């Protein structure tokens, strides 16, 4: 019925228009009866009729005078629900100030006058006098006054003296004063100002007033003089026993204030002296304050047994406030709860139901079904017959069940797969029967967890459930990329047993005419389930466009593989199942089908997989027995030597030759080595256990150990568990984290010493305590993630933007752990793809990279491309489809409307449960060395030595593909060159883990510009045996000596300060602190020869702090400017550091700590955005100096690396979209629209400038700077005022929304939830667009 909300202040006339009369007395009831007075507070004449279609006297009875007033009681004869909304007003004898602007900490009244509120309260309660230009020559309009001074001024001037009292005087002042000349004068003042403390105050004031004048509200209206009254239905007044009432706090304050009004009316009825006028006016002031807000200013309840009472805030503020709990989190009907079990005989789009739950849920539908058939006559008859369990109830209910899907959800609905739909299948029992496969989505083990069943009502809800929440539609991972219908726990073992190969068994070596009769041999029990037979099968290929050409051939395989081929669908090659199928492969299998055949063939394929897997797992039979797992004999013997060697180390510690710490390292290392040896031995024994002869000689083959299938198929367990069961259990760490020196030599199958058992306990208790405590903090994290990314609804298809830079596979030093092909998968290209073949374009731009172009890249050696990104999408409060990418829920591109923020938040937060809380480089692949940031010089040895601290080396494939990448620390010699084809296992750069500083020009070293002993200390150390050079700092060396920043004077054979020829500088190199130089004096040093040698967390906290962008302990400071760096001075604290840019702002310096290492020197030609120090960096500087795209790859790199460390993958779209909302604010550089520097919406500024540019062409508008904000702060500073009022400080948001005339467009999501109107995210988004297009268009 609407699509936007505006909020502002009200005018007294339209306030009266809201009302429907004037209330005189607090008489809400008369004694001896129970009829509210027609002239009292509960005025039926103004609130409406007391009984439906009846006046107060009832002279009109409900048929002949409906909707019309009555002659006796002036109330329209209508229904009573109008009373639920009809409301009146009260006229105030004297105006009073709305106290919220008083009681808000950034008080609106005081900020508007820039003058304190403490005297404002005094003048409001008539304790100080306010002047109104009492004299034309002495004072101003806005000075407080005393009655003694009032008398003094009366005798002084009198004639021009006039100064009223209280809130009426304040309102007269505000109405008399304007704000226009205010705005121009403030604009002039702030234009030429220097003060900063008042700068912010003045900017806020000018913004407020310039918005206020545009808003159209009046300050006088802010000081209310007419008070509305609420409809009485909201205030509960039941007539209690003995003529009593519920005493609603609302009625208490109404009676109080109306009595004050009546008293003031009586006081003004006889021209009473002003002595008592002040008393009554003040008391009425506190009365209205208490009614509007009690407990905030005076705390004057005076209407209860010394307890606080609900005045107004309790209905808005406080947990009793109904907003954020009575539309967020509550009970519901048509729902049930019950335990779950396993229904391994159902199709995937079905669910079971116990009969009792079925009838209880559907008995409203049952009554309609029976009465429509006419079998029942009355509602009571229907209720009693269905209660008696007739014969017809069962089949009619089975009829109505057939099309009425129900919804299922586990209790912790972590993500969108938490809630699904099914068609019920009525069954007997008392437990919910679930499909096994879908059970992997809920993460609902069958340990007795409970699930809840809901049921939709309307046709729209049922159709939407069928269209969306069928288990069939929700198959792929919303998180990253994979079906969630991956074959479940049991079926995988059945599949593995299906497809094996024994060297010899019954029925081998023959041929079979097809899969049809192949199972005939097995079903008769004449051939083994797995054999070495040869069979001919006919399949199809999708090579023909829309046609499946059939081809056949004889292929060697096993019997079971033919059985699987029986159910595999049409268009799939046979080679995909020729191998010993495992868990990961079969999962991939489904994906292939989903990318070839569609959806329905895939789902029927999944059901067939389940059925065959269970059938042939049960038919197979594989228990676990004591002799099933086997311990290697060698193990004990092996560890015996380990034990012996431990004793040996003890003797070295017994002799005092070694200390415990190195002995500790020795013993832990040797124990780890023994563990590795025994684990390898027992893997070797188990893997190739089976040695079965075939036609004479014995010959080994893959083992048939039940544990070996159960693990190698990957249904359950891993290498660690199997190692624990038989071999070394390993060595556990003592609870502080350090590893205890004694491993638990025995395994579970063998015995355990109790001390070994006792030791291993706290290792398990640690992890279990972590899992117990994790379930709270992680979940709350998701909350912070949803509020910032609440709306983010895609709204338009394409804005035409073509931005972004080089979406490339990150290489992690060694082997690259992710390819390009998955990274750009599902992303739509921004720029046209240029094949590395001299402009032979392969992929046209504005095309979706799903598979075909993805399949076109590997053969073209394409390794660097860019796609559209939501950060680089410049729409208005939305995202473009061709700027968003391919939604992972369905293989096609994202449709229009589907919410992205909520999906992203849930996908990011779901792995929290598995998220735990607490010198040289050697190449390994073949290629040609490639160096980035090439700054190297030929050394004295003929090789290359770098002089740029940020040097980095890479190895490139011969096909143009990057294969390796390595940091090159400053002053590292190169053992190779760029482009030289070198294979793996060859070191190319060498350095030390202390750091070297190396010259750039050859010649002697005439050590001048330093003071011997003072600046450089000739520390003739005994170890080096020579008088070296130590360039100590100001504090380390003499301060008086260290007042010139000494620089060694490298000289040529002429003994002169040789200069870099004409270009930069002489050979003077500013030696830093502790510049250890082993030379004494005047020794020839070539170019590129050494000068000196300086002697230099948890997953959940990491994620949480990264999303807050909280600064680290040590921000690795960055050179935010180019030029040539210099060195500053030393202050009382950290050493000053001045810079010398080659141009621009030459006098630039910063406050640099000296205790921590500073790998920066005078001869550092600094550039645009190069780090100075080393260590952690905050996002703020990276954002503000090296562009937005720098952080975009930064946060994603960090979080995805963390998750990969935990072995969890999420597609990069989800992690970065919140960034597009995290980076939602900006500051203003150049003025023209805003005042100067306020931080506001960046998208708002961009839309303001973009439209301005064509309108007021040539205006600078506002050059700006897009800054960041913590997700918490981002939530606080949301544009939508309703979202802020939902959960924090409801008082202020209403104030500065009403005075500023805030107009909410409901661009968000939670705001649409709060008011109860439909959400415009899913089908609602189509609904509103359809509503907008048809109506009012």
């Amino acid at each position: 019925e609407f699509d936007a909300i505006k909020i502002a202040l009200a005018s007294p006339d339209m306030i009266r228009s809201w009302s429907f009369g004037e209330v005189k007395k607090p008489e809400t009831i008369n004694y001896r009866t129970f009829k509210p007075e027609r002239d009292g507070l509960f005025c039926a004449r103004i609130f409406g009729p007391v009984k439906d279609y009846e006046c107060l006297c009832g002279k009109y009875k409900r048929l002949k005078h409906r909707g019309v007033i009555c002659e006796k009681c002036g109330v329209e004869v209508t229904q009573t629900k109008v009373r639920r909304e009809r409301m009146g007003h009260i006229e105030l004898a004297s105006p009073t100030a709305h106290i919220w602007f008083l009681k808000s900490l950034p008080s609106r009244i005081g900020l508007l006058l820039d003058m304190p509120l403490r005297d404002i309260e005094r003048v409001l309660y008539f304790e100080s006098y306010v002047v109104i230009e009492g004299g034309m020559t002495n004072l101003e309009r806005q000075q407080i006054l005393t009655e003694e001074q009032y008398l003094d001024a009366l005798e002084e001037f009198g004639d021009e003296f006039d100064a009223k009292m209280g809130a009426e005087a304040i309102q007269a002042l505000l109405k008399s004063m304007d704000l226009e000349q205010e705005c121009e004068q403030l604009r002039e003042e702030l234009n030429e100002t220097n003060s900063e403390t008042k700068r912010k105050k003045l900017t806020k004031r000018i913004k407020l007033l310039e918005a206020f004048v545009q808003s159209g509200n009046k300050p006088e209206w802010m000081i209310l003089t007419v008070l509305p009254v609420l409809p009485p239905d909201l205030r509960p007044l039941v007539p209690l026993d003995g003529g009593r009432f519920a005493t609603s706090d609302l009625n208490d304050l109404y009676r109080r204030v109306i009595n004050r009004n009546n008293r003031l009316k009586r006081l003004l009825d006889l021209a009473a002296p002003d002595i008592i006028v002040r008393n009554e006016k003040r008391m009425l002031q506190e009365a209205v304050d208490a009614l509007l807000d009690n407990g905030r200013r005076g705390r004057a309840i005076t209407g209860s047994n010394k307890r606080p009472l609900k005045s107004l805030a309790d209905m808005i503020k406080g947990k009793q406030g109904r907003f954020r709990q009575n539309l967020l989190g509550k009970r519901v009907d048509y729902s049930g709860r019950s335990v779950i079990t396993v229904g391994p005989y159902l199709r995937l789009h079905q669910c079971g139901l116990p009969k009792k739950m079925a009838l209880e849920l559907f008995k409203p539908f049952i009554y309609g079904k029976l009465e429509l058939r006419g079998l029942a006559t009355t509602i009571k008859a229907a209720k009693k017959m269905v209660e008696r369990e007739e014969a017809v109830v069962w089949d009619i209910l089975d009829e109505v069940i057939r099309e009425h899907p129900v919804l299922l959800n586990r209790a912790p609905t972590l993500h969108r797969l938490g809630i699904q739909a099914f068609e019920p299948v009525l069954i007997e029992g008392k437990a919910i029967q679930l499909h096994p496969l879908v059970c992997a989505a809920y993460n609902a083990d069958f340990d007795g967890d409970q699930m809840a069943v809901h049921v939709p009502l309307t046709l729209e809800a049922q159709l939407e459930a069928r269209a969306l929440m069928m288990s069939t539609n929700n198959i792929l991972s919303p998180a990253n990329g994979e079906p969630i219908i991956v074959p479940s726990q049991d079926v995988v073992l059945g599949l593995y047993y299906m497809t094996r190969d024994c060297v010899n068994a019954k029925g081998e070596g023959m041929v079979l005419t097809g899969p049809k009769e192949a199972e005939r041999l097995y079903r008769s029990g004449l051939a083994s389930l797995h054999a070495r037979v040869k069979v001919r099968i006919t399949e199809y290929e999708k090579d023909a466009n829309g046609e499946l050409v059939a081809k056949t051939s004889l292929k060697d395989t096993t019997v079971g593989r033919a059985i699987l081929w029986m159910i595999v669908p049409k268009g799939l090659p046979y080679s995909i199942v020729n191998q010993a199928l495992g868990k990961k492969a079969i999962s991939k299998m489904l994906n292939t089908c989903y990318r070839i055949l569609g959806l329905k063939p895939t789902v029927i394929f999944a059901d067939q997989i389940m059925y065959t897997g269970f059938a042939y797992a049960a038919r197979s039979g594989a228990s676990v027995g004591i002799d099933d797992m086997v311990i290697p004999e060698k193990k004990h013997e092996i560890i015996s030597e380990a034990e012996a060697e431990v004793a040996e180390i003890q003797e070295q510690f017994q002799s005092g030759l070694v200390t415990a710490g190195e002995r500790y390292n020795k013993v832990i290392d040797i124990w780890a080595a023994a563990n590795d040896r025994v684990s390898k031995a027992m893997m070797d024994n188990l893997q190739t256990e089976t040695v079965i002869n075939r036609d004479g000689q014995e010959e080994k083959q893959v083992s048939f150990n039940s544990i070996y299938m159960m693990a190698d198929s990957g249904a359950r367990g891993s290498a660690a568990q199997i190692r624990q069961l038989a071999g070394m259990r390993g060595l556990m760490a003592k609870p502080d984290g350090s590893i205890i020196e004694t491993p638990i030599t025995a395994n579970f199958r063998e015995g355990l010493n109790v001390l070994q058992y006792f030791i291993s306990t706290h290792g398990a208790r640690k992890g279990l305590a972590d899992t117990a405590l994790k379930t709270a903090n992680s979940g709350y994290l998701t909350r912070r993630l949803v509020d910032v990314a609440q709306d983010l609804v895609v709204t338009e298809d394409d804005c035409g933007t073509h931005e972004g830079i080089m979406m490339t596979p990150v290489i992690e030093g060694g082997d690259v752990k992710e390819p390009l092909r998955d990274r750009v998968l599902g992303r739509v290209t921004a720029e046209d793809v240029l094949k590395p073949g001299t402009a032979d374009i392969l992929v046209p731009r504005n095309t979706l990279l799903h598979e075909q172009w993805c399949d076109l890249l590997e053969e073209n050696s394409v390794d660097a491309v860019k796609v559209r990104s939501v950060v680089s999408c410049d729409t208005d409060f939305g995202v473009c489809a061709h700027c968003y990418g391919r939604d992972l829920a369905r293989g096609h591109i994202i449709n229009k409307g589907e919410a992205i923020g909520v999906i992203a938040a849930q996908s990011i937060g779901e792995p929290g449960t598995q998220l735990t809380m607490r010198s040289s480089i050697q190449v390994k692949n073949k290629g040609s060395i490639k160096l980035s940031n090439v700054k190297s010089v030929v050394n004295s040895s003929g090789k290359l030595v770098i002089t740029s601290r940020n040097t980095e080396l890479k190895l490139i494939d011969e096909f143009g593909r990057t294969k390796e990448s390595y940091k090159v620390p400053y002053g590292a010699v190169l053992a190779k060159g760029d482009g030289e084809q070198v294979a793996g296992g060859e070191t190319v750069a060498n350095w030390d883990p202390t750091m070297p500083v190396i010259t750039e020009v050859s010649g002697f070293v005439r050590f001048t510009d330093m003071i011997d002993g003072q600046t450089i200390t000739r520390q003739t150390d005994e170890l080096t045996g020579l008088s070296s050079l130590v360039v100590l700092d100001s504090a380390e060396r003499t301060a008086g000596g260290k007042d010139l920043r000494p620089a060694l004077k490298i000289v040529d054979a002429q003994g002169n300060d040789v200069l870099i020829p004409g270009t930069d500088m002489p050979a003077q190199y500013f030696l830093p602190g502790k510049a250890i130089v082993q030379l004494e004096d005047g020794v020839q040093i070539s170019s590129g020869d050494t000068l000196a040698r300086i002697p230099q967390t948890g997953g959940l906290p990491r994620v949480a702090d990264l999303f807050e962008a909280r600064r680290p302990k040590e921000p690795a400071i960055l050179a935010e400017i180019s030029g040539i760096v210099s060195f500053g001075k030393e202050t009382k604290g950290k050493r000053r550091l001045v810079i010398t840019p080659v141009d621009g702002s030459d006098p630039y310096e910063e406050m640099i700590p000296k205790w921590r290492q500073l790998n920066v020197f005078e001869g550092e030609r600094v550039e645009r955005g190069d780090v100075i120090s080393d260590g952690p960096e905050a996002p703020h500087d990276i954002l503000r100096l090296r562009g937005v795209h720098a952080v975009t790859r930064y946060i994603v790199n960090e979080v995805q690396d963390v998750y990969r460390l935990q072995g969890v993958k999420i597609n990069d779209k989800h992690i970065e979209v919140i960034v597009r909302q995290m980076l939602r604010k900006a500051t203003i550089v150049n003025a023209g629209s805003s005042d100067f520097l306020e931080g506001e919406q960046v998208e708002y500024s961009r839309v303001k400038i973009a439209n301005r540019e064509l309108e007021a062409n040539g205006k600078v508008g506002a050059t700006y700077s897009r800054d960041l904000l913590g997700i918490t702060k981002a939530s606080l500073a949301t544009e939508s005022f309703i979202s802020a009022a939902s959960f924090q400080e409801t008082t202020r948001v209403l104030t500065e929304a009403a005075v500023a005339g805030k107009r909410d467009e409901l661009r968000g999501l939670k705001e649409n939830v709060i008011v109860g109107r439909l959400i415009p995210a899913g089908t609602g988004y189509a609904y509103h667009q359809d509503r907008m297009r048809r109506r009012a268009a």
Binding site: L459, A467, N473, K600, Y1327
Partner: peptide
């Protein structure tokens, strides 16, 4: 009976217009 709307997705694909039009058809 019917459980998959993949045909509508691949021909007139939008998970909202089709469900809304089905709703207004079935309202009768």
């Amino acid at each position: 009976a019917r459980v998959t709307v993949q045909d509508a997705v691949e021909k007139i694909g939008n998970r909202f217009d089709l469900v809304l039009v089905a709703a207004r058809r079935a309202r009768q």
